[PDB]
Paper text:
The bacterial pLGIC from [name] ([name]) is a cationic homo-pLGIC. The crystal structures of [name] show a common scaffold with the vertebrate pLGICs, such as nicotinic acetylcholine receptors (nAChRs), except without an IC domain. Opening of the [name] channel is triggered by extracellular protons, but it is unclear which titratable residues are responsible for the [name] activation. Vertebrate pentameric ligand-gated ion channels (pLGICs) regulate ionic conductance in nerve cells and play an important role in fast synaptic signal transduction. They are formed by five homologous or identical subunits assembled around the central channel axis.
The first one is at the C loop region, where residues E177, D178, and R179 potentially form salt bridges with residues K148 and D91 at the complementary site of an adjacent subunit. We performed mutations (D91N, E177Q, and D178N, termed the NQN mutation) to remove the potential of salt bridges. However, the C loop of the NQN mutant shows an outward movement and the interfacial gap in the C loop region, measured by side chain displacement of D178N, widens 3 Å. The NQN mutation removed the salt bridges but did not generate hydrogen bonds. The resultant free energies of –29 kcal/mol and –26 kcal/mol for [name] and the NQN mutant, respectively, suggest that removing the salt bridges at the subunit interface destabilized the open channel conformation. The mutation shifted the EC50 from pH 5.0 in the wild type [name] to pH 4.8 in the NQN mutant. Apparently, more protons are required for channel activation to compensate for destabilization of the open-channel conformation due to the absence of the inter-subunit salt bridges. The pertubation originated from the NQN mutation site was transmitted immediately to Y23, L103, R133, and K148. Among them, R133 and K148 form intra- and inter-subunit salt bridges with D178 and E177, respectively.
Residue numbers in the entry:
A (entry chain D), E (entry chain B): 4 to 316
B (entry chain E): 5 to 316
C (entry chain A): 4 to 315
D (entry chain C): 5 to 315
Amino acid sequence: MVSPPPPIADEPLTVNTGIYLIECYSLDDKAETFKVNAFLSLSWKDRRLAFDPVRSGVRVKTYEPEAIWIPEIRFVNVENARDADVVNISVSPDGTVQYLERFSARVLSPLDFRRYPFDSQTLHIYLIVRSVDTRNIVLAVDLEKVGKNDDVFLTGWDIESFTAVVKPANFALQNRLESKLDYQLRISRQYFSYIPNIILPMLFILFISWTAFWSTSYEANVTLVVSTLIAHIAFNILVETNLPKTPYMTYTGAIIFMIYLFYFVAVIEVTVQHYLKVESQPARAASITRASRIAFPVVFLLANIILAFLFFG
Amino acid sequence: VSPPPPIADEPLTVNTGIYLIECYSLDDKAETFKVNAFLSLSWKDRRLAFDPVRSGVRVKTYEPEAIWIPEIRFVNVENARDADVVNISVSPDGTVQYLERFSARVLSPLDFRRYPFDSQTLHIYLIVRSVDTRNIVLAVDLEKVGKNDDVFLTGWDIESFTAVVKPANFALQNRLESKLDYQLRISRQYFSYIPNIILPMLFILFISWTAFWSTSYEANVTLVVSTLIAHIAFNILVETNLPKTPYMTYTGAIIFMIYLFYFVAVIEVTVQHYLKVESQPARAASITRASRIAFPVVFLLANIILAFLFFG
Amino acid sequence: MVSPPPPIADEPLTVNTGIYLIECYSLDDKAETFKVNAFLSLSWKDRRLAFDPVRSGVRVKTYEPEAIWIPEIRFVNVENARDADVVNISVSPDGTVQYLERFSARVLSPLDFRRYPFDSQTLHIYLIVRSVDTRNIVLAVDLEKVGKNDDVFLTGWDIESFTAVVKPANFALQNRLESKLDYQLRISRQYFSYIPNIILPMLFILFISWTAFWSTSYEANVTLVVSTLIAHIAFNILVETNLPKTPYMTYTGAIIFMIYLFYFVAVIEVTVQHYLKVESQPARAASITRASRIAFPVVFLLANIILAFLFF
Amino acid sequence: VSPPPPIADEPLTVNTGIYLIECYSLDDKAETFKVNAFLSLSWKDRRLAFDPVRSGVRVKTYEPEAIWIPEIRFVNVENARDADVVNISVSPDGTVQYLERFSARVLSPLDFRRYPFDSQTLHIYLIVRSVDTRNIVLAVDLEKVGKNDDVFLTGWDIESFTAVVKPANFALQNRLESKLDYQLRISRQYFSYIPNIILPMLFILFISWTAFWSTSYEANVTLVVSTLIAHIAFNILVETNLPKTPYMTYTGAIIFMIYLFYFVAVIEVTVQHYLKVESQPARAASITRASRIAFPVVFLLANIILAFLFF
Amino acid sequence: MVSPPPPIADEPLTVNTGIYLIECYSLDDKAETFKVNAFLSLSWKDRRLAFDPVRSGVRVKTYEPEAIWIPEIRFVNVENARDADVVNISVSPDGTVQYLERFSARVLSPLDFRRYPFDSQTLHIYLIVRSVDTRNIVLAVDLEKVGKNDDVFLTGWDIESFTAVVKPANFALQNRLESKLDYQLRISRQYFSYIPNIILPMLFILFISWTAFWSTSYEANVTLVVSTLIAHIAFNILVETNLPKTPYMTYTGAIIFMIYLFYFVAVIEVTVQHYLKVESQPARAASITRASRIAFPVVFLLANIILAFLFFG
Ligand SMILES: CCCCCCCCCCCCCCO[C@@H]1O[C@H](CO)[C@@H](O[C@H]2O[C@H](CO)[C@@H](O)[C@H](O)[C@H]2O)[C@H](O)[C@H]1O
Ligand SMILES: O=C([O-])C(=O)[O-]
Ligand SMILES: O=C([O-])C(=O)[O-]
Ligand SMILES: O=C([O-])C(=O)[O-]
Ligand SMILES: O=C([O-])C(=O)[O-]
Ligand SMILES: O=C([O-])C(=O)[O-]
Ligand SMILES: O=C([O-])C(=O)[O-]
Ligand SMILES: O=C([O-])C(=O)[O-]
Ligand SMILES: O=C([O-])C(=O)[O-]
Ligand SMILES: O=C([O-])C(=O)[O-]
Ligand SMILES: O=C([O-])C(=O)[O-]
Ligand SMILES: O=C([O-])C(=O)[O-]
Ligand SMILES: O=C([O-])C(=O)[O-]
Ligand SMILES: O=C([O-])C(=O)[O-]
Ligand SMILES: O=C([O-])C(=O)[O-]
């Protein structure tokens, strides 16, 4: 019973799979991984294990994994092989097997940071099986064996759905045939905390720098504008250490970067206004400084609209 | 290796209890803790029954592979528990005493709203899945449930460890599951936050307020801006030690409120120097005179209002 | 066999234990744990294994662990079950067993930080054994099997002693009998590095702030006193991240918090002197500023003395 | 459980290939990466040979304990690989096809000179040690060598995965070792460094240069020293994410060079106020007038020279 | 066999050892540990296994580890027991065993930080075997089995030599006998990076603080001197979090501490110069400040030499 069940015809062996999530947890943005704890259910027909109900008298016979051949099912993206404990194995009279295990794996599914922290992610778990010489194996989904618990909580995220792509992608690698199945976790980030923790404070320190437009004092203007620039770096650093380095540009990264210009420009202005006022044309100096108090906030709200437009529209 | 047959119409009851030996590594960001305990399991398998007077031994000892043992799992654990079986014992009627020593890492979500004044109820869930030949049902044996007196969770006070006796039995995938809820109850020891965070965070606020006794703009800007920065160091320090909640923490509210008092104190500092640059010190020093009262009052006012919303 | 030696007497089985430290390392203050590598020696009498020296011809017989019953000795405070390798097992003719393993476990021993970093700590390793139904087990110490190597070094600490408490504390849990033994490592922290790294620089930034008392310039005084405040926050945080959050107050914790007052008050003085001097009574202004230059250092040394007294 | 004999005097050739499934966790300070791949091994043991027509099965399936398998190790890995044997199959003539799926953590040093413009070659080394009864020799079967199309190394671009075909055979402790070299070729993705490090690092420098259009010492010192501090924050931030090299990184040169400009800009600032305090503003504002030019020019000059030496 | 080979004399069993380094890596200064991957070679003669080459037909007999008795060789300083996989076992007709394993251990060897980062270290790997009652076991070194690969690289360090001290120190612990062997890895730290990353930037901030000696402006001098103090704290902290806490005084620790004094005195001077200048005695004030411009750098170069002298060596 070690080998695989023989086909009484010309046809491939269909394994029926399902995943029911018990724990979902440890989503790690920098590593782009998350940890999962679930039931795996497997079902297939090995007729060699078939038996007579009345002769045997038991409605169903129970086997150990070493007793019967079980197909080799792998996750494609996992750091290592999953840690699994076999819950139960059952054979129905005709040779239909019902396998149930409980596994803990660490899944590696890449993420999209463009709209961070407003982004939504689709996490992927890929099931795979390699066909043998004596026969070909093909995966399939049994939908009542697919679901998630109601206690499932991914900290800092909202779980929309866990569903499977029912048609497996069959393909050829190194002369054997592989059947790949895709289970998808769909989650949206909880953005609330980012607002009081990062976004608002980052605005306040910016607005504060603008009070330098109501001052003709260079010492106090420089001190003001430079000190708030520094604080904006602390936030820049804080944000960037908590994210992976993307080949592309994050929304927050844009905003954070745009704000770098407004500080640079405001230094020029502060510098210009003091250059005129030292050269005795405060006529222009206070005229520019008068325009600043308006243009600066307008071009901000302007830019932010354009940015938010490019990203979310 | 097959489960005990009913001589009746009835399900199998496994009697569980948990006794805490070590409790430790409560991690706020991860929302996990580590635990070391005895697991006690007890059930009747009549197939193992024997005569007390004939056999002469009060109790018989088996190894785990010898006899059928029910599969009991924790629902919320990072992985399967690491356990060493302490003892197995059979008494004449077929009653088994199973005792193991396990260490697991439990994932129990936390409530951060009152931080760091909060209290938490940690949950350990035991579960068992029913078989085809029979249904298994968990139940609590209370003298097998407790905790050691050396049990200490650092930075926490342990109120109680108790079990909810009625298992919640339900249906998952055509089988039956019996789930039990063991509860650890703890309150956060908040003392250290006072000298470490809450107090220093006030001083810098108060220091920021002496700018109301100054008419000097360079020295007021320096004053108010420097205390702002240190308040960021504290804002950052606090939030890195906490997970990101969909909701608003008490300390988080306070820290955020305090951001406003810095913003307005900046407005005043700027206003006062604008009037006084334009030669109307009449209003300028009048405002600056009024702030010295309003700020501490509007502070104490809000703090009272906040503390009400959170703790009342 | 898989059963414990029968007493021919009314007597308990006494197991003779000792620990000899090979490696000691990774003392972690925040977690309150240390890692240890040692020999465990176990010795007890099982008569079933007894034999005649001259008939059998070997002074001593050697067994593999699966052959004979060995008592289950556990550590009470450890993150997980110890990782151990059996070095040797030997039976002497009368039925005396000599068991030796080499283990590495991670022990969880709580610490007292009140005198930090001038404190001394006693770490506890607890050995335990649970009695079975056919017989009771009791621990005892063989003092020649207890020691530590001379290369044993605990980084950043000085090791005073490794000794065992000889009378086991026996007690009852779940109808069985538990025998608990206590091994004590005694260490004193090496405080030297804290002096150039933390304590001294922290005084300097304080003293530096005090030169504002020889200055009448507010613009430069605020900058001075506020800038040194910030550095004191850096040192406050640097210290606090390396310690667990205690329900009580540390020596270093007191000093650092005490110093926060001197910064707050110095701001008041600095502010007062400038409010007076703007109101044209430099008589008062420069009088206070002259008096602070004395009071501040004296009330410091006063406090430090008072603090050091309470703490020691 | 003994190695196949030699029907002539000849070494045993094991045919190896690695096919990347997951590549991930590239760590610059440790100089490691983690890998998930198939290992394919193939060799001929005639003791296992059988007749295609008489025996009737195209192929026979074994468990690992039945037959002798050569011991193949990786030279650079933190520990032994975690491996699961996928399949073992024997063809009539005695040729074995061995397949496992392993996860290892590889230790390959990196070259940081052009950081973050650098490209790296990661090395996986396979090795086998000869026995007393026979010599074993590695060889590459190229259709068993590849990578999945979903394979992604975060923050890097993967150019190629290829193998060096001639094993370097040599003598260690009286036996013979056949070592094979698999090369992962990757280029760093530098884009993020631009808004996150390089640009802000320039702004704070340029801002410090506005002190040349100001005659105020109080506000100039405040300016120039405060912008210096931010450059330390960036100097520290950069160097903590890199291992300590005996040589000089590009970014390291740039960051170090910029330390000079702050020192000189301080000297200029001090001089200008020393002249202006000693009352020859003729020179003071002349120097300060030249600074507004020299500084940006000697910078752009040096930066070109730096990029030249490095590229 | 669970028992050791019998003496044909009154003499001990000599196990012949060697270590050949494959990988050396993860030197951790704070923990004082490093990781190693090497071959272990063991050779000893157990005559119970002797055989006739022609009768048995094998030139050499190959055994599995459970088949034959192997001595228990342990490492003294390792966090846990080594993780070892056995490469080969071979018996020659006379009963001479050749054992070869490949192990990866994490060795704990304490360090000397006094000359940091100019320091050189000797790392120690200690092998040990405990003697039994029926016989005494004794370690010895076979030098052709001892070496290291030419690819062995310890990051941030230069490896001088890998050699073994051949005479084992045999001694008595708990009524049995221990034979201990000492393998010595000799390394010197690569100090280059420390220069542009710490030492130079740390000198610049000090020198910048000295320009306050060419200024009579107190507001601008206090800002200058105090702000550079802060930067030096960052460098002190950065350096110290990267080192273990020594009971003794490090070279870098000395310099960093000494420099705290030059910052303290420069504040005194800066305070004095403005106290005199406030009291209308510029005669002395600018006189001191004229001397500081000399004394400060000289008392520095003077001190640095005395320090560098005391440390080396
Ligand atoms: C008021 C303001 C004054 C002070 C401002 C605050 C300054 C604080 C700046 C320092 C923040 C921390 C930066 C250093 O991060 C480092 O992160 C590295 C990990 O990525 C670690 O690397 C180092 O440690 C290894 C093991 O000990 C060594 O072998 C490496 O050589 C070493 O580089 C170091 O242990 C660790 O120190
Ligand atoms: O083999 C795997 O990848 C798994 O399922 O963990
Ligand atoms: O095989 C089974 O059903 C089991 O593990 O109980
Ligand atoms: O401070 C100044 O010189 C000013 O008012 O521009
Ligand atoms: O056998 C066990 O310990 C179980 O119930 O999982
Ligand atoms: O199987 C589990 O998850 C457990 O209970 O340890
Ligand atoms: O938690 C589990 O079920 C496991 O990993 O075996
Ligand atoms: O000090 C002030 O108020 C100023 O800057 O004009
Ligand atoms: O049997 C023992 O000594 C144990 O508990 O590992
Ligand atoms: O389980 C334990 O405590 C042990 O044996 O270390
Ligand atoms: O010099 C003094 O004593 C003063 O200012 O009062
Ligand atoms: O010998 C083996 O099975 C191997 O390649 O590790
Ligand atoms: O031991 C090894 O090198 C491996 O992981 O294959
Ligand atoms: O102000 C200027 O343009 C100058 O100094 O030449
Ligand atoms: O420059 C100053 O601030 C002074 O001398 O008063």
